[PDB]
Structure 1
């Protein structure tokens, strides 16, 4: 798995791969790793899929309950706080989870990283999975805050491609999302074999 996310002037961008393995046998190659929690939030899958789906569904339900009760969209900080305080009651059982919560609240964009151990932290560039190490190198050398939209897309795509080239437990297709002040949008879903020729 390789999932990355970063924020800049015109909001946040998320990217992920589409492979799943069971040992050394490729089960499927068309997985959805960018979860659509709500029309204003987004998630991410890494580790166990059942967990990273169940708990995020519960989170979405709680967000909707809050919106109904208080008549105001919830914030990213409180959402990540909820998600962290939910799985902390299952410390030392076998749960594996690594997640990114992204959004835009009254004080601007927001990106938080969460995991099953308990460390919840903000930031501006994040990447997790078995191929995060290869993607950090490409994301750093190329990152900038005063960037355009037509370029961050290519940046994330190239990072994911170069991560799949070396890592064996990651490959398949590349999914990319972009969040804005209004809501998020699905911009593209490419294939690695169709990108290899685009480059050399």
Structure 2
């Protein structure tokens, strides 16, 4: 569950921290918020390997382009490079991204689909928890939000996903990108799913396991 919300002086993206293999939770706290450039951040849904690979590739090419032109990276550049790559592979790279950031031309918020279609909005959501999040955004969003209001709305939208979507769960990651200042990445901004203390310790009495053969392994060459 990933969302992006524009406020009057920048843009904020938020995401949950659940990685799934089918019905099994693989990672209870994986970071879905990726850095394309210092002030351009990306939230990824769909094929996990694809969202990570495509973000690192365009991030690498954006850096090289930034050094070449001696200019700050632009969001429209990251957008154009992602859409042209995803389109070339006819959706076989299953990456669904909300790309947001600030650059010389101001603050920007876009969504990119696997087939290479782009949308522009003041509020967006993607993933299995898209509809749970979008319901909250369509209820509470107004024009001219403050930084604290936008973080609250974005955070509330991810919580909607965590509770009401089985695909989403655990914690809320947030990244704030304000026109004036450095982008602040808030890893585990909320942790509302802490595991209660176990009823028992399952520490085994030493010698419980039957061993056949023992040997020291050689690490040094």
TM, length-normalised to structure 2: 0.81
Q: Which residue of 2 aligns with 1:73?
A: 72
- Structure having the larger proportion of residues in strand: 2
Q: Give the 3-state SS of the residue equivalent to 2:35 in structure 1.
A: coil
CA–CA distance in 2 between the matches of 1:86 and 1:162?
32
1:26-41 alignment to 2 at 5 Å?
26-41=25-40
**1:42 to partner: Cα distance:** 0.4
Q: Give the 3-state SS of the residue equivalent to 1:159 in structure 2.
A: helix
CA–CA distance in 1 between the matches of 2:160 and 2:119?
26
CA–CA distance in 2 between the matches of 1:74 and 1:158?
30
CA–CA distance in 2 between the matches of 1:193 and 1:183?
29
- The match for 1:95 among 68, 93, 96 is 93
CA–CA distance in 1 between the matches of 2:39 and 2:146?
22
CA–CA distance in 2 between the matches of 1:55 and 1:187?
23
Q: Deviations over 1:65-119 (max 9, x none)?
A: 1112121123111221011111222115x32110011111232111111121121
Q: Which residue of 2 aligns with 1:62?
A: 61
Which has the larger Rg? Answer: 2
- The match for 2:162 among 148, 164, 168 is 164
- Structure having the larger proportion of residues in helix: 1
> Is the Cα contact below 8 Å between 1:171 and 1:192 reproduced in 2?
no
CA–CA distance in 1 between the matches of 2:5 and 2:156?
14
CA–CA distance in 2 between the matches of 1:188 and 1:151?
19
Q: Which residue of 1 aligns with 2:113?
A: 115
**1:188 to partner: Cα distance:** 5.4
Q: Which residue of 2 aligns with 1:84?
A: 83
Q: How many residues align?
A: 192
Q: Give the 3-state SS of the residue equivalent to 2:42 in structure 1.
A: coil
Q: Which residue of 2 aligns with 1:193?
A: 193
CA–CA distance in 1 between the matches of 2:62 and 2:157?
32
CA–CA distance in 1 between the matches of 2:165 and 2:121?
25
> Which segments of 5 or more consecutive residues in structure 2 lack a partner in the other structure?
195-221
